[PDB]
Amino acid sequence: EEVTIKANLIFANGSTQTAEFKGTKEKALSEVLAYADTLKKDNGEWTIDKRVTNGVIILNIKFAG
């Protein structure tokens, strides 16, 4: 239930930032997507892909600009 989500925020200008979240799986994922949505105004539409590596959920969030 409790998981660690690592979010790689990949911006179209070439910069990238990372944020980490821990909480119950269902709630945490939904929350990270809602946060990604707040970044759209300044960074464009996002696309996400997911990988579960060594127990950690890795989310690559790419903004189109």
Q: Would the annotation count 1 as a binding residue?
A: yes
> 39: number of CA atoms within 13 Å, CB side?
20
Q: Would the annotation count 49 as a binding residue?
A: yes
Q: Would the annotation count 31 as a binding residue?
A: no
Q: Would the annotation count 26 as a binding residue?
A: yes
Q: Would the annotation count 20 as a binding residue?
A: yes
- SS3 assignment for 34-54: HHHHHHHHHHCCEEEEEEEEC
- Binding site listing for Zn(2+): 1-2, 20, 26, 49
Cite the annotated binding site by residue number. 1-2, 20, 26, 49
